[PDB]
Symmetry: C2
Subunit: 236 residues, 2 copies
């Protein structure tokens, strides 16, 4: 299994820079896109553009510039009011940048950002805010693949996590349900999902863990089987 | 709130017969469709067709006839071998039928069928097989809406469940992860999802439960705000 990372973590094997980004406003259908910019992206809401002279404010111009969706079609005025208050403090944005195969956040926005994800701390139960201007590791593909290997061998029953969950402007994790959060964003490293699928679809020749569950045939089953036999005969 | 069911449970308000049906083979992308046949549907795999003279075997001809996807593109021969053994005993199928706004299963297939869902029993932890030829209630929209009402009022923190999960040919629920199940199907009553969205997007005028989380502005925030002010000025 030691050859696997070198074999698989490669542009000819995986889309190493692809992130799927799903925006969700409370009570609306989600809106998703995929970016493959190798510098990463910046999620933000602004009338102003990132420029070279203002990188301190808005980050590097090479990031994929991904705007939060208009809240216009939020039917509740009260909800759209709160939502606009948050979007008003999202001008500087949340940078998501790949460093090798690790994904990092850099929060620039005045809006607070809270998150859940593969590298998030698991020592308490309270909210998990992202500190402004502090490079925060969200996900490691190296570690993901190590864990994937143990899962596939059946050494763990838990599939390794890859999805990163952000809540903008309200605390998370929380007692309260995600359905009631005004603004959330889910981010998937597509290479990780692909790798989980790939490994899930590889079984052992030796360790046959599979016990099919099939009733004994009743007379109805028997009639069906005979009809299948006759149909096979008739073909030809 | 007593007027709500009469108001909402109506064809002019909701798609009362729409089910989304998602097929998933281990390690493959899922494959989904939506049916809106008011009789319901039959999930099956067969070279034979439902006919009038064989309703005992294959169910009523009015059901939407939904075939499991070919397992051809499953890359593991061993996996596709087990998968074909299950598909070979799925000729008679699993009927999903609406009775008013309740959804019921009738298993005809020789393959065993196990499930998780809104009406599933919660007294033990073991597998939950569907009994062949026994009308099995999966979901109640009436009850869903009652629960939705309590959620929206904040009387419960848990959103009411609507998704029904079937595993064909292997035990469920189980120690083992769903990612390793050969054949699963997820079924959503679309009216229920719509209703959850609708209710989630209705807030109170009085019970304002929302505390926005926004840092104090630093000098960078202040410069951004001034640039926004200048841009608003410049517009016009």
């Amino acid at each position: 299994e030691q050859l696997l990372p070198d074999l698989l973590i490669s542009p000819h094997m995986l889309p190493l820079t692809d992130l799927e980004i799903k925006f969700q406003y409370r009570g609306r259908p989600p809106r998703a896109l995929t970016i493959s910019n190798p510098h990463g992206c910046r999620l933000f809401y602004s009338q102003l553009e990132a420029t070279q002279e203002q990188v301190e404010l808005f980050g590097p111009i090479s990031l994929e510039q991904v705007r939060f969706p208009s809240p216009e079609d939020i039917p509740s005025d009260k909800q759209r009011f709160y939502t606009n208050q948050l979007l008003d403090v999202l001008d500087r944005g949340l940078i998501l940048q790949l460093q090798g195969q690790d994904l990092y956040a850099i929060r620039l926005c005045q809006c607070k950002v809270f998150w859940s994800g593969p590298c998030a701390s698991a020592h308490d139960s309270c909210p998990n805010p992202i500190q402004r201007e502090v490079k925060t590791k969200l996900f490691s593909l190296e570690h993901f693949l190590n864990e994937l290997i143990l899962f596939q061998k059946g050494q763990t029953n838990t599939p390794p996590p890859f999805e990163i969950f952000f809540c903008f402007g309200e605390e998370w994790p929380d007692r309260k349900p995600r359905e009631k959060k005004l603004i959330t964003v889910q981010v998937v490293p597509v290479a990780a999902r692909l790798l989980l699928e790939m490994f899930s679809g590889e079984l052992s020749w030796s360790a046959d863990d599979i016990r099919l569950q099939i009733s004994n045939p009743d007379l109805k089953d028997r009639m069906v089987e005979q009809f299948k036999e006759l149909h096979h005969i008739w073909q030809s």
